[PDB]
Amino acid sequence: MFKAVLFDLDGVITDTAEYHFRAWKALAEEIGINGVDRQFNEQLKGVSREDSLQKILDLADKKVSAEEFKELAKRKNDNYVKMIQDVSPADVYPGILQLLKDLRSNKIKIALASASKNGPFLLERMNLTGYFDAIADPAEVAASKPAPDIFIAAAHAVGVAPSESIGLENSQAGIQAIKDSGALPIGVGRPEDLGDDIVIVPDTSHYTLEFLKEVWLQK
Ligand code: NA
Numbered sequence: 001m002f003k004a005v006l007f008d009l010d011g012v013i014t015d016t017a018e019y020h021f022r023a024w025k026a027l028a029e030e031i032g033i034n035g036v037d038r039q040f041n042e043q044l045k046g047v048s049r050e051d052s053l054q055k056i057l058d059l060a061d062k063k064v065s066a067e068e069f070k071e072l073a074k075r076k077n078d079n080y081v082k083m084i085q086d087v088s089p090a091d092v093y094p095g096i097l098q099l100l101k102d103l104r105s106n107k108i109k110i111a112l113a114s115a116s117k118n119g120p121f122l123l124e125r126m127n128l129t130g131y132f133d134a135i136a137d138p139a140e141v142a143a144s145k146p147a148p149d150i151f152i153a154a155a156h157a158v159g160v161a162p163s164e165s166i167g168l169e170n171s172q173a174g175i176q177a178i179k180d181s182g183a184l185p186i187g188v189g190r191p192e193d194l195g196d197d198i199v200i201v202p203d204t205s206h207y208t209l210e211f212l213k214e215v216w217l218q219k
Pocket of ligand 1: 171174
């Protein structure tokens with residue numbers, strides 16, 4: 001039987017992408033740049049804070065000093081941190097609290113494998129801290145998704161190998177990272193995005209202990 005489940009945060013436990021988008025849009029309005037919409041925002045996902053800002057400036061060929069650039073970037077982060085003060089237990093995705101309860105009661109380890117610099121804080125705001133055995137620190141990995149480093153780190157932190165683990169993700173890069181770690185992926189989304197060679201469920205309500213056990217047996 002699998003010994004651990006490795007969770008991403010965004011797209012699995014809750015939505016942080018909406019708050020990043022609102023913070024970038026507010027920044028662009030402040031500096032007078034048009035075109036930061038949700039389609040455009042697809043180009044900012046999984047990209048560094050600095051590269052995202054540059055893509056926004058390039059919409060208007062807008063030049064700023066190195067100083068101004070550093071401070072516009074920090075300003076957007078400050079706004080994002082303000083916005084997530086309102087996250088609550090009601091923001092947890094369907095199925096996820098019941099899964100955490102069932103994993104804990106069956107002595108299966110629970111770890112976070114997220115790029116979020118605010119993971120510990122967000123789990124505290126959602127009242128989930130007491131379910132998690134470890135949180136991998138994204139500041140300590142040498143390579144980001146699709147590299148396997150953050151999934152290796154999450155597994156190791158709870159005393160298991162990835163090969164003993166299931167990983168849950170909604171992104172192409174995260175699924176590849178789980179695959180290359182040695183863990184078993186179960187995606188949430190559609191195979192058109194995530195692949196034909198893994199099990200995929202259409203939404204998080206399908207993530208049940210019974211289903212995870214079925215997928216592990218059949219792998
Ligand atoms: Na995700």
